Amino acid sequence: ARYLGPKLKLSRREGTDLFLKSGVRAIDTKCKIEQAPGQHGARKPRLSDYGVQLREKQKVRRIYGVLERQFRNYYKEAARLKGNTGENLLALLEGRLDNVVYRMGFGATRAEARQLVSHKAIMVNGRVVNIASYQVSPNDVVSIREKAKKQSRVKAALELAEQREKPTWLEVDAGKMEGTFKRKPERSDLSADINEHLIVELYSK
Amino acid sequence: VPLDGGRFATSDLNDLYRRVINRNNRLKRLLDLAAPDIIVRNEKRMLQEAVDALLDNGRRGRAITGSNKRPLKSLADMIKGKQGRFRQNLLGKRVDYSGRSVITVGPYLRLHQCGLPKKMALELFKPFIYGKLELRGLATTIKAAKKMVEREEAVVWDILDEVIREHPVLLNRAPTLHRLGIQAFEPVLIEGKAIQLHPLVCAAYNADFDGDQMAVHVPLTLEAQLEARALMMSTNNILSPANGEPIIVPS
Amino acid sequence: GQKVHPNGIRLGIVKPWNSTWFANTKEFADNLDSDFKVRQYLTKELAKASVSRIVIERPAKSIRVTIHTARPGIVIGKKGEDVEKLRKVVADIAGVPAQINIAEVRKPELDAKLVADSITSQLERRVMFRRAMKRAVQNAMRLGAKGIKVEVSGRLGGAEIARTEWYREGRVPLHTLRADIDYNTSEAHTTYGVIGVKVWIFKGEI
Amino acid sequence: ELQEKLIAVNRVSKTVKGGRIFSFTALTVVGDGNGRVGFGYGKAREVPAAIQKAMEKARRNMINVALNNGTLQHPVKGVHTGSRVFMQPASEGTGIIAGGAMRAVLEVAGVHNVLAKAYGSTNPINVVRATIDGLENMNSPEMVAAKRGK
Amino acid sequence: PAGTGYAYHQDRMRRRAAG
Amino acid sequence: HARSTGSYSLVTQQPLGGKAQFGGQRFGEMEVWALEAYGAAYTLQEMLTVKSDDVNGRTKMYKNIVDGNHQMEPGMPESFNVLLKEIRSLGINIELED
Amino acid sequence: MKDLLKFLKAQTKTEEFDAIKIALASPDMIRSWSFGEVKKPETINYRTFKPERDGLFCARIFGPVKDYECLCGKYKRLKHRGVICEKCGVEVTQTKVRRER
Amino acid sequence: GPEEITADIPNVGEAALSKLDESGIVYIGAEVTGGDILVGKVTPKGETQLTPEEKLLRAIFGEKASDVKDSSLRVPNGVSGTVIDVQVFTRDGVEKDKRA
RNA sequence: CCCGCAGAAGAAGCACCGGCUAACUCCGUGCCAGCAGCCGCGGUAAUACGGAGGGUGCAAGCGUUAAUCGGAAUUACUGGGC
Ligand SMILES: [Zn+2]
């Protein structure tokens, strides 16, 4: 599942603009971020202490397009993984192919990156993969089948990628779909001001 | 620069920078397309003139012919205004705690004195007025002292007289040739717009009362008050700098 | 009840009559009558005019009528609009050549009437009583004055149990005749009940 | 910068001749992500007026904890009234593990990784201080060498 | 370095020798 | 016209022209020579730093007069920092050593 | 954290200098100053009323318009400050960075 | 939206509204001084969103109609003087303020 | 498991929204009909009943029930009290 339905309000509720609709304009106006996330938006929505941990929680969740159950699993693993439980979660979501593809010029939105993978359009280490959740360890070379490179929307996605700050933890020759996994993404350079701790905390009582 | 107030027209530098960006992107595209030697040389010739005009519009025909901006205004022109950047950097320009008004006689005042206006003295010594009221306890805070000075109560002029009791004001003429032009004096209260300058002081400054302005200057800090009272005072500066004879004399 | 009218109690000293004129039992009967009709009407077509008081002088078959308002211009008309209308409306209503001179209200935040008609109007605008009652009335303390006691009747907010509110600043010694205070009422017929309000502005002492 | 935090606010009453009056209270903890805190408790006839006092009273009468790397030096233990609180430091990765008061008092003292628990009474007015007293005792790994070095 | 500033400049110049 | 403090320009943090937004009444290069000839260094320093150019210096100086401490914390004028930026833009590499 | 960072900016602002050196700027020396390379000749977009994605007046390059807030939205207040946004790619804490950048 | 010529004036008492007419502009015969309002105020753009807190504020104090208001014209500080004549130049399409 | 052919085509629902507990208004009903884990809702302007609009959560699942541990430092060895 993936909810489907709308896509903007999702980025309006949390507050800041997510990454489920990237391209021209958008963000502020043509959606009206912080105007009325629904029927009763602009008013007096007092905050809590549990919601501040759950809201930030779904924020980083709805982004990569992950369901609750699937996400929770990411945390359970984020424990065993020796090291800061917080970061581990992110690195787990980041290393996810679904994102690895997007972040590499391909697809204007991770939601679209999905379609590519699933439709055998994406190929890793020489072999095609349709499982988005596919873990992309280091050295992993990503690309697109020689039978779909000069497609259309893909070769077009990398255009705005020229504006979107390029990834530093992974190389990629935009020329002929040559993505590479230089090394595990360190939170020190993870495009987002996510408060991972609020998550690991919420996931405990 | 806004023409109406939101339109935002491109300034003198932005027109020059836009020409370089337009030339750079146009030439860079032609190298990919593999254009012949005539066009690529002509494109580089335009970039040579565009970059040169941006840095220094001189010794070459360039820029607009007085449509909005008159000459060009390059980065070199921004530095070299008239005599380098002497007006802004060296001189100072504008300077806070200052004013200007028409000259006046007023022989009743002393030699080391000046009949300053009442409204000007209130405006010039505004932070001193807030500090005096806040210290005395008339105003509760600086917000109340700001509202009191803006409203102009009777108690403000009482505190203003004590604030301008032993504090000199640096008066100066328009053509400051010698050091005698810029001189300090004890600022006295007077119901009038025109500033009262002494008759003996008029000989040194050379300012005849025929629509001649005289800019004031409130001396802030402890050191400048001692410097203006000792060095730059009217009573101290009696004899001339060039000649041995007395400057302040009967004219 | 257990309070004397903070205005009428002083109608003798430090407080003028909002309708000074002579008359005998004969016409006096219908006299104060017309004054009501004219005064009641002058508000109907000039509610938003932000009118304070409304005096009524009467020399001889020619009442004056003075409409004090914070918003004079609006009570003036298009260079003759309002004035003409009213000044003419006082026709058969009094059957006499009735004039009309407007008076500008200085600082509409210290006048009871206004500060009362306002808060009530805000209430009708779906607004929290406490907020306006306090702040939207607290102003009377910033433009000067020394003391202002407000009062909001019951039925405030969703509740069947009517309740009165306090909130007062400075000092309002309404127990002093030489005190002089600006008191006035104001209703607000809302979805339910008629939340009332009383403004007590202490404008200096003697 | 000082970071205030509103724990909670109760109403409380008082019966008298005429009838019965009320006066909300409210408790507030303030501090910086460095190592200083101090709660506050003030009453008032108004919900906002109350918190106003508690805050003021909060900024003053603070404290200075011997925090280390965003956590405690060792698992301290404090108690007050009927509140029994035990705090323990944890390596980086574990967020602030605490219920109400504790969770707050720490989210301003400069704590980032802990895991406490309120044993005695869950009263905020106490569990809030039962925690402060804990850190107030927190013996830092320093000075100890001097406490018995010579 | 003139008048009032000459005393401060002379004292500051002496400090530059050692540090 | 008279003025204590108010509006400031965007390019070089200095007061406005005169008789419009803020009453400037320019000092000029010639008046600096008169102050230098008489020997008023502290009077000359505040005129071209404290109560004119420096943004941080002006804010600190304003609080000193209100409190009744006087003195001055001049620092850098900012107009000189613009000269470093303008010189930097035209190919020259200017920078404050030590 | 807030008091320490605010006090750090005030104390470190008062920084002296002995002398001023001048020399020719190299391609790498200019690259050391550079932020994100001016591409387009556009100043500001007239539809949204904001600086253009990548031009002469930009949010990602140089700095943002607001004191302590992002161009798009979600990176507001004195909180966050040091971080950079995912969408635009601009620092939160700036205010007067456009004066020096 | 279009910026109207007040006919209300935001965040002002009876003192400011007394000088102005029902039109919005200053009345005939009024000694202007300090910082009095010359010609109306108001602005259309707000973008606050109807929240439970904002709805209560709008119901209590209704700012003309929408939830947005600012300013237009006032007398400069220092300069003072009486009114002798007023002229209105409405666009070819917009309906003719009260004084016009 | 691969290659190909149509065509967005064939594929979203469930609970909840007074507080704990993330999500609010308008009708109707008028201690009735009904709700309900606890405190409690309902006797004319019910964020608690029922419907609707909207929102929240989870999702080929959702909710209820049953039942063990947790919360319970409430059988306290770790770890309570008279
Ligand atoms: Zn952004």
Nearest by Cα to B74 from B90, B60, B58: B58
Q: Is residue H99 part of a domain?
A: no
Separation CA C168–CA C185 (nearest Å): 16
Q: Do residue A40 and residue H53 have CB atoms under 8 angstroms apart? A: no
Q: Is residue H100 part of a domain?
A: no
Question: D3 contacts in G (CB within 8 Å)?
Answer: 2
| Beta-bridge partner residues of D77 | D86
DSSP line for chain H:
------SS-TT--HHHHHHBBSSSBBPSS--B-SS-BSB----S-------HHHHHHHHHS--SSSS------BPPSS--B----------BTB------
In whole angstroms, I2 C1' to A157 CA is 29
Task: Say if G10 is an interface residue toward chain D (CB within 8 Å).
Answer: no
* 3-class state of residue G84 by DSSP: strand
User: What does the radius of gyration of chain G's CA atoms come to, in whole angstroms?
Assistant: 16
In whole angstroms, I35 C1' to D97 CA is 37
Q: D85 and D78 in contact (C-beta within 8 Å)?
A: yes
Nearest by Cα to B116 from B235, B231, B249, B217: B217
**3-state DSSP of C146-201:** CCEECCECCCCCCCCCCCCCCCEECCCCCCCHHHCCEEEEECCECCCCECCEEEEE
Nearest by Cα to G38 from G27, G50, G53, G54: G54
- Which residues have a Cβ under 8 Å from the Cβ of B223 and sit 6 or more positions away? E4, F42, F43, F72
- Which residues have a Cβ under 8 Å from the Cβ of A150 and sit 6 or more positions away? none
Burial class from Cβ neighbours inside 10 Å (0-12, 13-18, 19+) for residue B152 reads exposed
Spell out where C49-181 has E strands.
51-55, 66-69, 101-104, 148-149, 168-169
Q: For residue H38, what is the domain's CATH number? A: 2.40.50.150
Tokens 């039978």 found at: A147
Question: E3 contacts in B (CB within 8 Å)?
Answer: 231
Q: How many residues does chain H have?
A: 100
Q: Do residue E4 and residue F41 have CB atoms under 8 angstroms apart? A: yes
Residue D27 has which token pair?
């408790």
Q: How many domains does chain H fold into?
A: 1
In whole angstroms, I51 C1' to D47 CA is 37
Separation CA C76–CA H22 (nearest Å): 7
Interior CA angle at B84 toward B83 and B88, to 5°?
Answer: 100
Single-letter residue type at D125: I
Across all strands, nucleotide nearest H52 (CA–C1'): I24
Helices (H), B164-232: 201-205, 222-230
Spell out where A126-197 has E strands.
127-128, 141-144, 172-173, 178-180
Domains of chain A: 7-93+190-203 (1.10.1050.10), 94-181 (3.10.290.10)
Burial class from Cβ neighbours inside 10 Å (0-12, 13-18, 19+) for residue F53 reads buried
In whole angstroms, I10 C1' to A22 CA is 30
Where in the sequence is the domain holding H41, given as residue range(s)? Answer: 1-94
- Which residues have a Cβ under 8 Å from the Cβ of A11 and sit 6 or more positions away? A17, A18, A20, A21, A31, A33
Method: cryo-EM
Q: Which chain F residue lies closest to E3 (C-alpha atoms)?
A: F39
Task: Say if G4 is an interface residue toward chain F (CB within 8 Å).
Answer: no
- Domains of chain F: which residue ranges? 14-98
Q: How many A-G residue pairs are in contact by the CB < 8 A criterion?
A: 47
Q: H16 and C112 in contact (C-beta within 8 Å)?
A: no
Separation CA G11–CA H84 (nearest Å): 58
**End-to-end CA separation in angstroms for chain H:** 22
Separation CA C31–CA C27 (nearest Å): 6
Separation CA C52–CA C182 (nearest Å): 11
Single-letter residue type at H28: I
Nearest by Cα to A70 from A92, A85, A38, A99: A92
Q: Do residue G85 and residue A27 have CB atoms under 8 angstroms apart? A: no
Distance of CA C145 to the CA centre of its chain: 18
Q: Give distance in angstroms: CA of A31 to centre of ligand 1.
A: 15
Distance of CA B22 to the CA centre of its chain: 39
| Beta-bridge partner residues of D118 | D85
- Which residues have a Cβ under 8 Å from the Cβ of B163 and sit 6 or more positions away? B125, B128, B129, B132
Burial class from Cβ neighbours inside 10 Å (0-12, 13-18, 19+) for residue B46 reads middle
**Choosing among G58, G61, G74, G91, which should be mutated to test the A contact, i.e. which has the most A CBs within 10 A?**
G74
Task: Say if A15 is an interface residue toward chain H (CB within 8 Å).
Answer: no
Helices (H), chain A: 8-13, 51-64, 68-80, 85-94, 97-102, 110-118, 153-160, 196-202
Strand C197-201 with D3-8, pairing? unpaired
Out of B8, B10, B21, the one facing G38 most closely (by C-beta) is: B21
Measured CA distances, B58 to A33, A115, B19, B83, C195 (Å):
50, 59, 17, 16, 79
Separation CA E2–CA G47 (nearest Å): 58
Residue D16 has which token pair?
């008298």
Helices (H), A65-132: 68-80, 85-94, 97-102, 110-118
Across all strands, nucleotide nearest A71 (CA–C1'): I58
Q: A111 and A101 in contact (C-beta within 8 Å)?
A: no
B245: closest CA of chain E, how far (Å): 24
**CA dihedral (H79, H85, H90, H92) positive or negative:** negative
Q: Do residue G41 and residue B21 have CB atoms under 8 angstroms apart? A: yes
Q: B232 and B186 in contact (C-beta within 8 Å)?
A: no
Q: Is residue H15 part of a domain?
A: yes
Q: Give distance in angstroms: CA of C10 to centre of ligand 1.
A: 65
Nearest by Cα to C101 from C39, C57, C59, C61: C57
DSSP H or E stretch at residue D126: helix D124-137
Measured CA distances, B66 to A90, B69, C161, F95 (Å):
59, 6, 78, 37
Burial class from Cβ neighbours inside 10 Å (0-12, 13-18, 19+) for residue D55 reads middle
Separation CA C11–CA C5 (nearest Å): 10
Residue B89 CB neighbour total at 10 angstroms:
19
Q: Return the half-sphere exposure (C-beta side, CA atoms, 13 A cut-off) of residue C194.
A: 4
Resolution (A): 7.6
Residue A48 has which token pair?
């809590």
